[PDB]
Design a protein around this ligand. Structure first.
Ligand SMILES: CC(C)(C)OC(=O)Nc1sc(-c2ccccc2)cc1C(=O)NCCO
Lengths: 319, 331, 320
């Protein structure tokens, strides 16, 4: 019931993927799809005009910031930017609480990226306007989790069915210790009938805190077993019967056409990007690779999220 | 008569607060109030669409620039920004006169902030388009003066009456030497029936050039007396029978070194304790940011309005853009 | 409308990417925008588009020019700015960066001192790119607005009439002035004669004289009065319809234009300069009705709007 769920999402801050429930995730995935088709058919997309937002990027994060700016502009709204700056030069004197209390009186909402853990939680306390977390230094990056999930759902829409018979399996590969992109998606995936293969070098294993959240969430839905989670130190074994391969950022695990010879027919490769050697150019040509569609889907998910939070009357729903 | 006054203000450059006369101040205050209500009642605010402005900020001044950006965008216009730059890296050796002659052919108006005194005066000579000064070195910051005045007028609308019997008293507290925010507002307030209490440390007293402008302006309106201006070095006396307390910034970079800053940054800290012996109706202003001047405890105190003040900048900057750039007689 | 259909989704990198018919559409459209704007008419002929402006060197005048064009057409733009090749491309391939960026937006305005980077950007981008300047000297929009200016005062450059020939003096640093090279290339397609005025070790490169010579021959306009070389203004500024003065960049004077040095030029001569100036042209000359370097800079808005409109329209033509 889009309209029940829209009323509930109106003026919601999105900081953590756990701020988004079952019903909300469904509206986001249904709305993101409507924006994918509207844009792909070159139709009018101005479903959120008359908003003025502030984008605050206190670390270099060009790809994410351009993603949000494009979302806002394609919806027909305007944005004022703070950019190419850091915590100390932005907040010259000033308490984060004063800066957000004032900033939030000029605009309808704020997109905030800040390496500081604390600063985003203060910004939410202090802001009279909704804030969307664009990434901080606890690894909260909800929009990346949501667009990772949207990608996977398009190839395997039975993840949403919670079907004891239809289980999805995924390999996370590379640096699982620091890959906060893995942690955030794991958290979201484990809400569903999903199995995990953690492929790493020893001193970059998945943290225990994360194994525990997966284990807790799989048990809540009666999908936990001894084949819920498995750990490999090599691709050959690790890439076995997996519907998704998700490669992390920063040798041990370079994806090549050779190393994809014994994967499922239907397997799809994700990567939050940028890459460096993790995935060889040769793989871009391989029909299993979808990391570029994934990045593209960021636009449709960020538009859907802005639409669902900031729409006023909302009557003329996306079609 | 907003129609007569709007025709007169169309294409006006606003550089100093003395560019703004009686009638114009009234239009600005009346228009700013209309934008306060429009925004507070979630109505359409796109009263100035199809304009394209350049915002040129050649010093870090993020809060003022965001204020102007929001004003322009909420009016339904567009803006190209120059930002995170300084005079020499922008001009790369080109005359300010050539740069503004060219820039002003691409856009409808320019918002200009530059620490250089001279640069803004030249920009106005050379520009074929109206300029709003968003702050320069000489202390001219007309939009801060206008939003300071708008705030005060909302709580004490009899400043506008020039009634011999209804007089407003204001304490400016802190750094009155370098607080160019005090000098600009003093200049505007003294046009009216106002009395001043300058509260400072000795080596941060108000300059005499400013006392003389106040004195001259109060005489012109037959409001001068020897209780027009009083000087205190302490809050107890200084905050006595005053309708407004205006607290200034303490800016470390106006001080020979760190040691001079600290010996003055905590001379006058406003607390709930130090507001015991003020009028019931007194209101606290601060152009912000604060650092210690005002204890968080005071934010909860109904006398504090420094956050409303900051908020009012959006309404005053929208009003001023609308009055200068709109092509038509409407509201 | 024939020419617009053909230009739709074109990348413009080099002035040689623009042909006879395309140059005519650009000149006709740029004039439509000049009149619309000068008469304060609605100019929103390209709404609902979203561009990315990527400027990986400080180039304020050109960047603001394109941003103003995009906004006056009624479209939106997200800016990357005050960044320099290595800090953008944190360590990422130019090909990945453009493959992704081009999925968010309708078109990209790209300035980058790297030669290579712009060519990679065009290979990788699923969207049209307009080159706003690179470090081979390609700057098509500057050539287009230089040509538009000249055409306004001497519209017989377009006629290719053996009897109506235009003569132009390029003055200053002809070696490095890649603004001269780009315009020379475009002018020589027409019935034009060239006077290169310089100090010896800043003469025009031979590669450029050869392109002029080739293009004049192709149209049967070449002769031994096609190109002439002076080391002084007196001779060099002889019977020339256009004087184009160059920048002198001290990272790499002899010819100051004054009212004195313009006394024995044609009555109809017009002075261009891509700007900024320093001493090349005395402020006294601004008052002289021959000077048009400020109209030239102004015409950048009309030409950049025309070019955006001709490429990005997907759809009542621009009228007065
Ligand atoms: C209100 C008044 C003080 C009169 O004007 C401004 O808004 N101008 C200024 S300058 C400034 C500042 C802060 C610390 C160190 C140096 C300069 C604060 C702001 C500002 O706008 N924000 C700067 C945020 O980085």
């Amino acid at each position: 019931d889009l309209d029940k769920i829209m009323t509930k999402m109106k003026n919601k801050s999105v900081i953590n993927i756990d701020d988004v429930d079952d019903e909300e995730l469904l509206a986001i995935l249904y709305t993101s799809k409507q924006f994918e088709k509207i844009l792909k058919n070159n139709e009018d997309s101005k479903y959120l005009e008359n908003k003025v937002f502030c984008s605050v990027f206190l670390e270099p994060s060009t790809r994410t910031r351009c993603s949000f700016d494009a979302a806002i502009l394609k919806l027909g709204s305007k944005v004022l930017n703070i950019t190419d700056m850091n915590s100390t030069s932005f907040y010259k004197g000033e308490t984060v609480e004063d800066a957000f209390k004032i900033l939030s009186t000029y605009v309808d909402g704020i997109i905030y990226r800040d390496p500081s853990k604390k600063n985003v939680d203060i910004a939410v306390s202090s802001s009279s306007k909704p804030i969307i977390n664009a990434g901080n230094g606890t690894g909260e990056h909800p929009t990346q989790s949501l667009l990772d999930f949207y990608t996977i759902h398009n190839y395997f829409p039975f993840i949403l069915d919670r079907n004891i018979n239809k289980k999805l399996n995924i390999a996370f590969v590379g640096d699982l210790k620091n890959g906060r992109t893995v942690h955030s998606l794991s958290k979201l995936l484990s809400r569903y009938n999903v199995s995990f293969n953690f492929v790493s070098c020893k001193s970059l294993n998945i943290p225990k805190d994360i194994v525990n959240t997966i284990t807790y969430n799989l048990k809540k839905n009666n999908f936990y077993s001894d084949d819920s989670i498995k750990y490999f130190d090599n691709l050959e074994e690790g890439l076995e019967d997996v519907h998704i391969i998700y490669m992390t950022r920063i040798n041990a695990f370079i994806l090549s056409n050779k190393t994809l010879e014994n994967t499922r027919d239907d397997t799809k490769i994700l990567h939050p990007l940028p890459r460096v050697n993790e995935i060889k150019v040769e793989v871009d040509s391989n029909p299993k690779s979808v990391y570029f569609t994934q990045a593209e889907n960021g636009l449709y998910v960020r538009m859907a999220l802005l639409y669902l939070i900031f729409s006023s009357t909302s009557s003329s729903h996306p079609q």
